[PDB]
Amino acid sequence: KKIKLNIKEFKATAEGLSPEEKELWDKFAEKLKKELNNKIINLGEKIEIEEELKTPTKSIKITFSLELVSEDTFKATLKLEIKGKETIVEEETVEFKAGETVKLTIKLPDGKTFTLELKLEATKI
Known part of the structure; x- marks a missing residue:
């Protein structure tokens, strides 16, 4: 049923x-950072920030x-x-396994760039 998320590593970059x-x-x-750390989620429940x-x-x-799909x-x-x-x-979607770091990056045509790299620990609770 319920899974708890914790952020182990987080990197955010914007240029x-x-x-x-x-x-x-x-x-x-x-x-x-605030919403994902200690968050309790369910299978199939989409988090949006x-x-x-x-x-x-x-x-x-x-x-x-x-x-969590x-x-x-x-x-x-x-x-x-x-x-x-x-x-x-601009949109980027990446599937990843629990235990994998996920990296998401967006770049606008004018060169502005936004990057998130997130290592979540997900455990059953």
Whole structure:
């Protein structure tokens, strides 16, 4: 039934951000760390963690999802949506085994890059 997640290693990297975008990224990273550590999840239950900024000229939304899709396999996604002068969506999905580190990276056409590397320990509880 219930699985407990704990973060053993976490690395977040972002390149090319404006000061506004850096504030957003910092919030998103802090929220990922808090929400995933000690989290109790069930098989088939999708976790979604999102942060957004809406400005007079631009919208940016970053979404991370995690789902335990079988007893020993996870699916994680990182998605970035930009609206305004440019409307772009970038998304990457990686399946990984429990005990594997997962790395997710997004790069926008303008060179901005967002990367998460996460080693989760998942145990039955």
